[PDB]
Every structure is written in structure tokens, then in C-alpha cells.
């Protein structure tokens, strides 16, 4: 299925949010990404 | 920091624009050293350049250009 | 002696007799081809108009409004409804045709607010009423002592809140005495029992 310039951006953001919390924030907070979206298991919008 | 307020005002309409285009270029050669995995950074400065450009534009509008 | 106005006012006491009747039979013909909301340049009933608030000023507008004659164009109940609520033909609205006219008009002229209204005839399948509107954003009226108040924010979209003269008459707020128990100060604060 073809996409629009817009959708293509949304998908991209949706993929960036899908990265893990930096190992450094770990140490700064002295101690989990609750929005980890797998491609197969989960479904985005649209 | 390396660029204060009074000083921005003492300049002429043409100097702000000249300095703005000077910093814009340094900020641009900054993002290139970073996008290149570069290490000779000085983190405080790349931040400053942004705030400086704000100060300059902020004054440009304040003086009537 | 009698003013010129008093003639027009008298003529209209029996619109079926004399010259006015000969007039109605004419205009009405031209009135039936005209749209619902038509802006006319001058009041048909100059007297009544003036006596309602009319003035030959900038920002004072008049207009005729034609509405279908009849009873509740109520659709029949589709689900289960007991014998009493099974009406469609007979039951009529609780809002008189004149008031319906005022609204169709105020809408047509968004920015304007409604001063008053009055009847100007009716045939076998429609009734006409003229409407006096005012432009509360025009300095003429903002400066005119006699109309100034209509600019007040709390006067905006007044015809829709029933704040007209024809409105209060419909709401049963004429007599300050007997009968007005269930209408003053408002229908909603009386549980809608009038």
C-alpha cells in the first residue's frame, strides 16, 4: 500500500519512540519504556 | 556568555545581521562536527550559539530592525 | 389632530376591507414569488414599525419573512408509544409562527440583533411578518440613546433566548398577576409547566 509524505513522518516518529530508554538515564534516576511497540505483535494507528 | 546584551545594542542594524550570519555559520559548522561523530565538541557552546541568535533576533525586533 | 400614521394604523384594523384589501390581493401575488427572507427598504406598517422602535437611521433594517401555514409537522413515533403520545396531525408547537419568523431572520442577518416584529398579512398557505433588526456594531446606534442598549453583550442572540417582545408574550409573561405563577421568572426555573 502507498503512503503520503505525512504518514511517512508519523510512521517515523512511531519508530523513534520505539527505542529504549538510554543506559545513562538509568544512572541519573538511580533507577522501563512503557510504550514498546513490536511490529508483528502490536498495531499502530491508520 | 561570550556575547552580552549592551553590546548587541551598541551595534548598527548592519552589524547584527553581519554577526547573526557569522554565528549561524559557526552553529552550522558545529552540527556538522557532531553529525560526523566528532569528539572535539564543547557542549556549552553549541547551546550558547542558539541562545545568542535568540538574543540578536530579539534585539533586531526591539530596535525596529 | 390625527397624524398621517393614525391612518395607516386604522386601515390595518380590517385588512380585508377597502383599499388595503385591494392592496393585499396585489402585493401578496408578488410576495409569493419572493424568497423566505427578503430585505425591504421601508416598513409596510410605518406606524406599528415606529411604535415598535423603528427609525429612519443607519443600522436599522427591516425585512419580510414567509412561513408555511399549519400544525405540527411532527413525525409519527417509531418505537413503542402509549395512545396519548401517539399524535402527529393535531398537536401543535409551543412556539408561535411569529417567533419562528424572527429567528429565520436573525439567522439570515447574523451580526444584526432583533428589535421587534409584526404581522403583515396571510393567505391560505402562509403568513407574513416584517422584522426590525439593528446593527449593534454601528456608531449611529451605539450613540443613539433610544436604541443604545441593544449593543450590550447580554443582548446578543436575544431572539433565540426568547428575549423578544413576541417572545415574552409566548412565554406567558404578560400579566404580572394570576396565571403567571408557573412562568415568572422563567419557564425552566418553573419546571416547564406553562
Amino acid at each position: 500500500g502507498k503512503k503520503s509524505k505525512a504518514t511517512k513522518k508519523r510512521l517515523a516518529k512511531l519508530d523513534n519512540q520505539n527505542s529504549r530508554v538510554p543506559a545513562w538515564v538509568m544512572l541519573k534516576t538511580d533507577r522501563r519504556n512503557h510504550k514498546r511497540r513490536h511490529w508483528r505483535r502490536n498495531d499502530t494507528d491508520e | 556568555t561570550v556575547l552580552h546584551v549592551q553590546e548587541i545594542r551598541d551595534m548598527t542594524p548592519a552589524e547584527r545581521e553581519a554577526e547573526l550570519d557569522d554565528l549561524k555559520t559557526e552553529l552550522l559548522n558545529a552540527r556538522a562536527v557532531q553529525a560526523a561523530g566528532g569528539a572535539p565538541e564543547n557542549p556549552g557552546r553549541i547551546k550558547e550559539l542558539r541562545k545568542a541568535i535568540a538574543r540578536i533576533k530579539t534585539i533586531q525586533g526591539e530596535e525596529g530592525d | 389632530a390625527r397624524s398621517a400614521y393614525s391612518y395607516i394604523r386604522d386601515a390595518w384594523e380590517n385588512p380585508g376591507d377597502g383599499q388595503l384589501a385591494e392592496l393585499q390581493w396585489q402585493r401578496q401575488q408578488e410576495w409569493r414569488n419572493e424568497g423566505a427572507v427578503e430585505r425591504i427598504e421601508r416598513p409596510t406598517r410605518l406606524d406599528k414599525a415606529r411604535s415598535q422602535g423603528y427609525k429612519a437611521k443607519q443600522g436599522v433594517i427591516v425585512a419580510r419573512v414567509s412561513v408555511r401555514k399549519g400544525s405540527a409537522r411532527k413525525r409519527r413515533h417509531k418505537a413503542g408509544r402509549r395512545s396519548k403520545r401517539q399524535g402527529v396531525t393535531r398537536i401543535t408547537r409551543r412556539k408561535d409562527i411569529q417567533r419562528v419568523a424572527e429567528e429565520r431572520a436573525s439567522r439570515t442577518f447574523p451580526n444584526l440583533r432583533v428589535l421587534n416584529s409584526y404581522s403583515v398579512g396571510q393567505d391560505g398557505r402562509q403568513k407574513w411578518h416584517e422584522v426590525i433588526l439593528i446593527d449593534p456594531n454601528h456608531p449611529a446606534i451605539q450613540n443613539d440613546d433610544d436604541l443604545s442598549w441593544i449593543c450590550a453583550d447580554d443582548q446578543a442572540d436575544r431572539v433565540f433566548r426568547g428575549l423578544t417582545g413576541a417572545g415574552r408574550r409566548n412565554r406567558g409573561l404578560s400579566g404580572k398577576g394570576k396565571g403567571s405563577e408557573k412562568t415568572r421568572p422563567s419557564l425552566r426555573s418553573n419546571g416547564g409547566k406553562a
Binding site: 509524505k5 511517512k8 513522518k9 510512521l11 517515523a12 516518529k13 519508530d15 523513534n16 | 549561524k24 552550522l28 559548522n29 552540527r31 556538522a32 562536527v33 557532531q34 553529525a35 560526523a36 561523530g37 | -
Partner: protein, 81 residues
């Protein structure tokens, strides 16, 4: 006011095109047309622009492939920054 050139795209592939083809890859604002990309490049690095190829990245940004005329040298331009 939005800036056309965001920054130089430096990757193994970008180098290839640069070495053997004299091409400079960039990161540019997504509203910037090929033509616009052209100008801002000639103006920022003082060169002659031949052709520009654009592409909207799966990184929310647009990617400009710009080729410098047979007179200018890519490798030399990208090194002074």
C-alpha cells in the same frame, strides 16, 4: 525563518558517492525543493551545482544528494568543516 541545510550527512555510503562520484549528501528541511537545495548549497560552499536528488527519509527528514560540477572537488569541500 526555516533553514534549508540542516547538516552534512556523513556515512559509509555518503563517502563512496563523494570519493568516486564527487557527490555531497545532506540533511535538509522537508519543504525545501531540489531547486532550493541547489541554491543554498552553491551559496554556503561556493561551488557550481550540477544535479540534486531528493528523498524523504524514514527519519522524518529529507535527504539531498548534490553533485558538484567537474570543476570543484567534493572531498576537499567536506574536509574543511
Amino acid at each position: 525563518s526555516w533553514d534549508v541545510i540542516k547538516h552534512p550527512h556523513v556515512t559509509e555510503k555518503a563517502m563512496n558517492d563523494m570519493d568516486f562520484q564527487n557527490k555531497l549528501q545532506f540533511a535538509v528541511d522537508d519543504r525545501a525543493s531540489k531547486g532550493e537545495v541547489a541554491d543554498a548549497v552553491e551559496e554556503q560552499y561556493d561551488v557550481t551545482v550540477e544535479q540534486v536528488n531528493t528523498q524523504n527519509t524514514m527519519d522524518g527528514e529529507k535527504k539531498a544528494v548534490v553533485r558538484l560540477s567537474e570543476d570543484d572537488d567534493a572531498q576537499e569541500v567536506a574536509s574543511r568543516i
